[PDB]
Amino acid sequence: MVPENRRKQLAIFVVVTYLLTFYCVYSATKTSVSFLQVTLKLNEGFNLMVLSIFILLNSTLLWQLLTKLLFGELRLIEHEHIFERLPFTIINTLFMSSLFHERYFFTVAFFGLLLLYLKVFHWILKDRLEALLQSINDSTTMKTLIFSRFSFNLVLLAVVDYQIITRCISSIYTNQKSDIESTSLYLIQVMEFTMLLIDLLNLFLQTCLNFWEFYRSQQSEGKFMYEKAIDVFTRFLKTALHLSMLIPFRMPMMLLKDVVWDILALYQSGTSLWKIWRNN
Amino acid sequence: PWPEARHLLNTIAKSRDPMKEAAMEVGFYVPMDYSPRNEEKNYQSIWQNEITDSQRHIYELLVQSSEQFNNSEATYTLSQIHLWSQYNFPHNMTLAHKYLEKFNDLTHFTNHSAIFDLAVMYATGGCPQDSAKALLYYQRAAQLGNLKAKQVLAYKYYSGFNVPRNFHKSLVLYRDIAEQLRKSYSRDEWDIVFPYWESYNVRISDFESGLLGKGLNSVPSSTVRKRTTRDASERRIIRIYYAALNDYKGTYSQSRNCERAKNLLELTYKEFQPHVDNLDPLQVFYYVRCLQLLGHMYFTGEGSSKPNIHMAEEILTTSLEISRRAQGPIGRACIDLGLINQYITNNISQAISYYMKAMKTQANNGIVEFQLSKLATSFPEEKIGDPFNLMETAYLNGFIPAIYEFAVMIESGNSKSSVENTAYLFKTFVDKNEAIMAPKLRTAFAALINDRSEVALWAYSQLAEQGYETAQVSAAYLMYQLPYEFEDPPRTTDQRKTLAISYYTRAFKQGNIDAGVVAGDIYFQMQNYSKAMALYQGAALKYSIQAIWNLGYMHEHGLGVNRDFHLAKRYYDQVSEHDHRFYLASKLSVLKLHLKSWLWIT
C-alpha cells in the first residue's frame, strides 16, 4: 500500500503541484489583458504540462475518494492483485494512446483513464464477489437485500458502461464525417467498454448460478460443468465481438494481440470442454 | 537685439535626429498616464537645474525682443522653440499658443503655417474644442495656398467627419492637390526614376506587443522594414551582402548610409571577379545579387557624384551573363537595362525585349507596365498589351505615378467613372506620395526616441487630421493604452480620453478593426454600455474574436441587454466555431454559464 516515506513524498508532491499551478496562473494573468490572452498563455507548453499534472493529481484523488465511498476499504489480497495486474494494462492503454497523434491527444487520455478506473472497479468487484462466496454465512438465507447491495454495485457499473457505449454508438451514427479516425477511436472505446460489459454479464450469470444453488440447497450434476459452460460462453462472445469489430478496421497490432490471446483462451476452452466430456 | 539673437542661435543645431547620427557607425519609452501638476513641476526643475547660463542670456534676450517691440520675427521663432522643443528647451503647449496668437495678431492672417497650427490647436482642444473656428481657419489657410490645409479639408469632406458627406468637393480638392504634386516633380524624377524617401508611415505600438494583445489582434502588423536578415568561406558573402542591404534601405533606428554600400560593393566586386568560377553551388546567387545591387547604385547615382551610365551597363550585362548559367535572377538587372536603353540610348526594340522578359518577375513593382503603356501610347504599332490594362495592372501593383496616370485616364473616359472610385484614386495618390505632405512623421519619431514624448503626441495629432490612419492610431495609443488585468486604469484627464475615443473611431472607420474593440473598451471603462455594443457589433460583423467574446460577456450580464443567457451561449459557440485556439476559453465560459444556471438551487 502506502509506506510512510511514500506518504510524505505524496504530500510534498501535492503541495508542490498546487504551488506551481497557482504561480503559473498568477504569472500568465498579470502579464495579459483579457481572458482570451491568458487562455492562450496557459495553453503554452510548460504551463500546459503543469496544468495537466494538476489535472492528473486531482483526478487520482477524486477516484481514490470515490473508491473509498463505494467499496469502503480493500482487503490486502485485492491490493496485491491490483498492484500485480496494473502495469501490463497501463502499457496496453499507452499503446492505444500512441495510435493517434497530436490531433487526438486529450480526449483519448480522457477515455483511457476512464477505462482504467472502470477496469480497476470491475476487478475489485470480481474479487469482492469471490470473497462473498468464501465468506458465505449460512445463519440466514442470502436475503434479497444482501444480493440487492451486491447487485447495486453491479447495476451501478452496468448502467455506467451502458450509458457510455450507447452514447458512443450514437456519436458514431451522427458523425458520418470525413473524420474516419474519430470513428475508429470511438470503436476502440466500444471494444473496451463492451469487453467490460461482457465481463459484468459473466459475473452476473455466475452469481445467479450460485444464488439458484443456494436456493435449491435450502429449499430441497456438478456445478463445475455449468461454471465452465458460462466461461466458454463469455469467452466466445469476446472472440466474436473482437473479430466482428477489428476485422473491418484491419488493425496491425491490437487485432493480432487480441486474436492470439483469444485463440489461447480457446485452447483453454477446449481443455475445459474435454473436462466436460469427462464429466458428461 | 534680434540680429545678435540670430547670430547666437546660429550655433546650437536645433534638433538632433538619432536616426541619422547613428548611421556614422532598440526602442523607446512611452508613458501610461498624465498629470499637469507633475508636468509643470518637471518643467520648473528643468529650468532650475539643466539650462546653461548662455542659454539663460539668449532666452532673456528673446523675451525682451519679442515683448518690447512688435518684432514679428522673434515671436514666431520663440513659439517654434517652445512648441517643437528645439535648442534643448522644454515643451510648453500654452505659451506656444500665446505666442502664436500674438504672431497671428501681428501678421493679420498673411502667414498660413501659424494659421494651420492654430486651427489644429483649436480642433484638438489641447490648450475646450470648437469646430467652427477651426473650420474657418482651415478655409483661410486653404485660400492662401497651403497644401496640407486643402488636404485636411478634402478628407473632412470625404469621410463625413464633422460635416455631411460630399464626394464632388473632395474630388475637386484632390484633383487640385494631385495636379500641384504632379507639377512639383521634374521630368527625370517622373519618367526615369522616382526618388527614394524613407517612409515612417508605421503605426507605433507594433514594436511592442501590439494593440489589444499579442496573437489576438486581427489586422497584421505593419512594420515592412526592420533589420532584414536570414562557415568561413560561405558565410562571408552572406554577411557582406546583408550589410550592403541593411545599409542601402535604412531601418527605423538607423537611417540609410549609401557611400558605405558603394565602397563595399566596388571592393567586393574587384576582389571576387578574378575567380568567380569556383563559386558554383550557392555563393554565385549572393554574388550576382550584390553585383546587380551595385549596378543599380551606379545607374541611379546614389552614394556618388553623378551616374556612370556606360560602366553600369557593362556591369549589368556582365551580371546577366553570369546569371544565364546557374539560372540566377534577372529582375533588377533587366529592369535597369530596359530603363537605360529606352531613354539614354535610342534603341527601343531591345528595351521592349528586356521588359517583356521582366514583366513576370517578382522584383518589379510597377515600372514595367508603366513604361510599356507609355510606349504603346507613343507607338501604337508595337502590339504590346492594352494601355488601359497595363496602367490598371500598374496601379494595382503599387507604383506611385501609375496611380495618378490611371486616375487621369479613367477620368478622361464611361469605364465605371463614378465619383467614389475617382476620389479614392486621387486620395490614394495624395496619401501615398508622402514625401511632401507627411514629412513630420520623421520629426515625430525622432523626438519620440529621445524622451520628448509630448511633442510626438503633438506631431501625431497634427498628422491625424489629414487622414493618415497610422498617425491617428499612434496619437491614440500615446493618449490611452489598454491596462493590464487586475490593475488600476490610467489617470488621464477627461479631454484626453474623449479625444482618444474620436481618434480610435476614425481609425476604425478608416479600415482598421482593433480600434473598434479598443474604443469599446474605453466606453466600457467610461461606464456607457450604450455606444459600446454598437462598435462591438460593427467589428464582430468583420469577424473579430475578442469583439465577439466581449459582446457575449456584455449580453450575459445585467449591463445593457438583460441576462439573455441563450444569446451568450450562442456567441460563445460562435467564437469557438470560427477560430480554434480559443477552444479552452469558450468551453470554460460555457461551463461558468452552466454553473451559474444550476446554482436553479435557489
Side-chain angles (χ1 to χ4, degrees), chain A residues 1-220 222-280, chain B:
Chain A
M1 201 55 218
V2 300
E4 55 280 359
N5 60 331
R6 185 176 179 83
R7 270 204 84 158
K8 67 94 182 185
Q9 280 212 8
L10 289 204
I12 291 301
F13 199 83
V14 185
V15 289
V16 164
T17 291
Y18 265 52
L19 286 198
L20 212 63
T21 50
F22 181 93
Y23 189 68
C24 275
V25 166
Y26 177 93
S27 158
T29 291
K30 283 323 280 178
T31 72
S32 172
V33 177
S34 65
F35 199 110
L36 280 306
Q37 186 193 5
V38 63
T39 291
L40 273 72
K41 273 192 184 187
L42 288 194
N43 216 27
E44 184 193 330
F46 185 78
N47 302 350
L48 172 62
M49 277 310 173
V50 168
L51 281 153
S52 66
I53 285 174
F54 177 90
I55 288 180
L56 290 175
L57 211 66
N58 186 285
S59 46
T60 71
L61 288 200
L62 163 77
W63 157 88
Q64 195 89 23
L65 262 294
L66 193 151
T67 290
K68 290 177 71 68
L69 183 157
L70 211 52
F71 292 74
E73 197 36 62
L74 317 186
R75 305 170 293 101
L76 284 183
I77 289 183
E78 319 175 349
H79 180 77
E80 301 140 11
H81 287 171
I82 179 63
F83 200 69
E84 198 275 332
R85 313 289 203 173
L86 287 149
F88 269 80
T89 64
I90 303 158
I91 308 304
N92 186 43
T93 58
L94 266 292
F95 154 84
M96 266 83 79
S97 88
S98 46
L99 182 63
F100 306 141
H101 219 267
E102 184 60 353
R103 297 68 65 89
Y104 291 160
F105 196 96
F106 319 100
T107 302
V108 183
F110 186 18
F111 287 133
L113 272 297
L114 200 43
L115 162 67
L116 171 70
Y117 288 150
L118 288 172
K119 278 189 297 210
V120 161
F121 280 134
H122 282 77
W123 292 335
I124 68 166
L125 181 48
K126 168 190 68 177
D127 288 331
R128 203 54 78 83
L129 168 72
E130 298 287 354
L132 163 69
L133 270 290
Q134 185 268 9
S135 57
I136 186 167
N137 196 256
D138 290 10
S139 83
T140 80
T141 175
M142 292 177 72
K143 287 303 177 184
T144 46
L145 278 73
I146 327 167
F147 258 115
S148 291
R149 175 72 164 87
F150 180 57
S151 46
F152 286 160
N153 306 304
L154 188 147
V155 295
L156 259 173
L157 298 153
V159 295
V160 174
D161 73 271
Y162 173 79
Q163 172 174 290
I164 303 159
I165 54 184
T166 57
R167 185 219 44 82
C168 170
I169 301 149
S170 278
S171 157
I172 284 175
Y173 190 79
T174 180
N175 277 326
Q176 295 294 321
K177 317 156 312 182
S178 313
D179 188 0
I180 309 283
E181 288 82 0
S182 59
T183 299
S184 167
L185 174 50
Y186 304 158
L187 205 160
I188 312 165
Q189 276 74 244
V190 186
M191 181 181 86
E192 300 300 79
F193 291 137
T194 59
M195 280 194 68
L196 277 176
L197 183 46
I198 309 304
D199 306 330
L200 295 174
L201 278 177
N202 166 258
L203 201 86
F204 189 87
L205 314 183
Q206 293 152 328
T207 185
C208 306
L209 171 148
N210 308 117
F211 165 68
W212 203 353
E213 178 271 348
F214 197 86
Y215 202 117
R216 291 174 319 189
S217 279
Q218 295 302 88
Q219 198 288 310
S220 176
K223 301 304 109 187
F224 288 5
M225 316 152 164
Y226 288 112
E227 315 162 28
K228 274 59 178 181
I230 312 164
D231 298 332
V232 188
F233 186 99
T234 71
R235 307 320 153 74
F236 154 70
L237 177 63
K238 294 177 179 172
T239 48
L241 62 80
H242 303 338
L243 295 174
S244 45
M245 67 174 282
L246 286 74
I247 301 312
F249 179 75
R250 299 290 201 282
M251 173 77 207
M253 321 179 197
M254 323 203 181
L255 157 66
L256 274 62
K257 187 225 181 164
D258 262 9
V259 188
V260 160
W261 184 263
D262 280 26
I263 303 313
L264 203 43
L266 264 290
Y267 194 88
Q268 309 275 15
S269 71
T271 45
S272 47
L273 164 64
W274 177 244
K275 316 195 193 212
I276 297 314
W277 281 118
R278 203 231 70 73
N279 291 267
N280 193 0
Chain B
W2 178 251
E4 305 182 19
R6 178 164 95 195
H7 205 139
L8 265 297
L9 296 185
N10 190 20
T11 81
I12 298 97
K14 310 183 287 184
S15 45
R16 65 174 215 103
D17 53 339
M19 292 94 70
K20 160 153 287 170
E21 289 164 4
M24 63 182 179
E25 66 184 2
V26 305
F28 39 66
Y29 311 98
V30 300
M32 280 194 110
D33 48 355
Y34 172 98
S35 285
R37 292 318 169 286
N38 190 283
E39 275 285 340
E40 61 90 17
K41 292 177 172 182
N42 200 322
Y43 163 86
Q44 288 294 339
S45 161
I46 287 304
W47 278 88
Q48 282 333 298
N49 303 352
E50 208 286 328
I51 300 174
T52 67
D53 62 338
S54 158
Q55 297 190 152
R56 273 79 173 271
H57 178 268
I58 293 158
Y59 189 76
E60 298 277 346
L61 193 149
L62 266 295
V63 188
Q64 190 272 331
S65 174
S66 181
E67 178 263 358
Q68 194 39 66
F69 301 98
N70 295 169
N71 200 13
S72 198
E73 216 192 356
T75 292
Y76 180 82
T77 301
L78 197 48
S79 89
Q80 287 307 274
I81 289 171
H82 266 181
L83 189 142
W84 286 104
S85 67
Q86 51 191 355
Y87 299 130
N88 310 63
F89 285 5
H91 176 105
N92 303 319
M93 202 63 200
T94 173
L95 197 153
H97 194 199
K98 173 177 183 302
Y99 285 17
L100 285 179
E101 193 49 280
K102 178 196 305 296
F103 175 100
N104 192 32
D105 281 339
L106 294 192
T107 322
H108 315 301
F109 296 83
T110 305
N111 199 316
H112 59 70
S113 279
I115 290 172
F116 180 48
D117 299 358
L118 215 67
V120 167
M121 288 189 65
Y122 282 158
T124 69
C127 318
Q129 55 254 67
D130 44 352
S131 308
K133 265 168 55 57
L135 180 59
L136 261 56
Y137 273 74
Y138 278 160
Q139 295 266 33
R140 170 62 173 184
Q143 318 286 14
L144 269 68
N146 199 344
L147 280 74
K148 308 159 161 64
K150 272 136 91 172
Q151 177 191 10
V152 60
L153 283 175
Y155 169 58
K156 204 168 275 187
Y157 276 164
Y158 173 87
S159 200
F161 165 55
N162 197 18
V163 301
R165 185 176 220 168
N166 180 308
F167 276 25
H168 199 101
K169 210 140 177 180
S170 88
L171 166 64
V172 170
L173 280 183
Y174 280 160
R175 203 191 304 112
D176 190 358
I177 313 188
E179 215 66 39
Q180 279 191 32
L181 293 168
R182 170 60 179 91
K183 276 313 163 183
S184 189
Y185 284 162
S186 167
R187 185 262 186 185
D188 215 40
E189 283 163 356
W190 190 264
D191 292 315
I192 284 294
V193 53
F194 204 77
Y196 173 83
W197 199 74
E198 303 181 359
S199 87
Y200 278 74
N201 210 356
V202 301
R203 45 176 75 89
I204 195 185
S205 77
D206 267 11
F207 315 140
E208 268 66 32
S209 69
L211 178 56
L212 98 99
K214 191 191 191 337
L216 181 56
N217 48 11
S218 297
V219 53
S221 87
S222 165
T223 62
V224 192
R225 52 165 186 165
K226 42 182 302 182
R227 192 180 179 80
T228 185
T229 175
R230 181 70 53 77
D231 189 304
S233 70
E234 301 167 348
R235 197 70 188 167
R236 196 153 183 269
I237 201 68
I238 308 149
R239 189 201 170 281
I240 200 79
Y241 167 72
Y242 275 161
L245 202 59
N246 262 6
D247 271 1
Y248 186 33
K249 324 167 181 277
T251 43
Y252 293 162
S253 300
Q254 169 178 358
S255 48
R256 73 195 286 215
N257 198 338
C258 180
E259 278 187 341
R260 198 188 307 165
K262 184 209 50 163
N263 290 22
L264 185 138
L265 264 300
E266 64 191 327
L267 173 142
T268 185
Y269 162 73
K270 189 160 50 54
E271 181 187 299
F272 266 57
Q273 178 56 35
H275 60 88
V276 306
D277 213 346
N278 304 7
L279 299 86
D280 190 327
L282 193 59
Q283 297 81 20
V284 66
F285 202 66
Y286 293 176
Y287 168 71
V288 69
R289 193 163 290 272
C290 294
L291 210 168
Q292 274 158 333
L293 181 45
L294 166 64
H296 171 92
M297 202 164 302
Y298 281 165
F299 165 56
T300 76
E302 305 153 358
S304 316
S305 88
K306 303 177 35 73
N308 274 347
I309 307 293
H310 56 277
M311 310 166 90
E313 172 173 14
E314 318 312 326
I315 290 158
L316 292 153
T317 188
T318 313
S319 159
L320 184 63
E321 273 205 3
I322 298 184
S323 77
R324 194 57 205 174
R325 66 186 184 273
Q327 60 275 349
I330 68 169
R332 300 312 305 268
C334 296
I335 281 168
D336 264 348
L337 289 173
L339 265 182
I340 294 184
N341 48 23
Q342 175 175 324
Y343 304 76
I344 299 312
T345 82
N346 308 63
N347 197 1
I348 297 169
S349 315
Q350 289 179 333
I352 305 312
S353 63
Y354 275 121
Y355 289 154
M356 296 308 292
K357 304 190 71 184
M359 311 188 39
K360 295 265 178 263
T361 48
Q362 176 267 358
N364 66 350
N365 42 6
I367 300 169
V368 192
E369 294 84 324
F370 186 83
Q371 312 282 347
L372 288 203
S373 89
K374 294 210 66 182
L375 295 202
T377 318
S378 199
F379 318 98
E381 286 82 357
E382 310 275 349
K383 312 98 180 173
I384 46 172
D386 175 276
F388 208 84
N389 218 340
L390 295 187
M391 289 275 207
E392 160 164 77
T393 301
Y395 153 66
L396 267 296
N397 296 344
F399 189 57
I400 294 92
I403 295 184
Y404 167 81
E405 299 275 8
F406 184 38
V408 167
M409 274 187 63
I410 203 163
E411 196 182 339
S412 84
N414 166 244
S415 306
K416 213 279 171 193
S417 45
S418 88
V419 70
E420 195 289 327
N421 50 57
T422 300
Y424 174 68
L425 294 198
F426 279 125
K427 189 204 192 180
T428 318
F429 182 25
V430 173
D431 272 19
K432 213 151 286 302
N433 74 341
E434 204 266 328
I436 299 169
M437 326 288 297
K440 291 302 184 241
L441 285 161
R442 173 76 167 270
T443 288
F445 207 107
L448 182 53
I449 75 175
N450 60 31
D451 290 331
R452 272 68 170 267
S453 159
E454 308 87 346
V455 60
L457 170 58
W458 154 252
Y460 277 135
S461 157
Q462 174 182 321
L463 284 157
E465 314 279 335
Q466 315 188 10
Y468 278 99
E469 157 199 16
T470 67
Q472 298 188 337
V473 64
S474 278
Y477 190 92
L478 272 74
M479 275 182 311
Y480 198 103
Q481 310 176 3
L482 267 185
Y484 279 166
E485 192 162 356
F486 295 151
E487 189 163 15
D488 203 292
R491 337 193 180 280
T492 55
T493 78
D494 189 306
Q495 188 272 328
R496 205 66 73 95
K497 285 187 284 208
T498 195
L499 182 73
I501 292 151
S502 195
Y503 282 157
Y504 277 148
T505 311
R506 294 201 265 163
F508 177 89
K509 300 190 196 305
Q510 190 93 20
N512 184 19
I513 300 174
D514 306 358
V517 175
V518 181
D521 199 310
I522 310 299
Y523 278 117
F524 190 24
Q525 159 58 70
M526 205 195 177
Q527 278 187 352
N528 202 1
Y529 308 98
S530 297
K531 229 158 182 185
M533 291 178 30
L535 278 164
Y536 275 106
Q537 291 146 336
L541 306 191
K542 295 178 183 177
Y543 293 152
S544 159
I545 295 100
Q546 163 84 33
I548 283 176
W549 186 101
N550 204 266
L551 185 45
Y553 180 104
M554 293 268 299
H555 270 292
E556 81 100 13
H557 289 93
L559 58 87
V561 180
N562 301 8
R563 316 241 193 195
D564 185 12
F565 279 53
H566 174 37
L567 278 182
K569 186 183 123 193
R570 191 168 292 276
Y571 282 146
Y572 291 3
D573 296 301
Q574 293 167 218
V575 68
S576 198
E577 279 212 349
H578 292 214
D579 204 358
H580 197 56
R581 299 182 316 283
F582 316 98
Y583 194 80
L584 198 155
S586 70
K587 297 301 181 192
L588 201 154
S589 62
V590 189
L591 197 147
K592 180 172 80 77
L593 195 68
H594 282 164
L595 188 148
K596 291 207 143 202
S597 278
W598 282 104
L599 272 296
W600 181 268
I601 298 302
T602 301

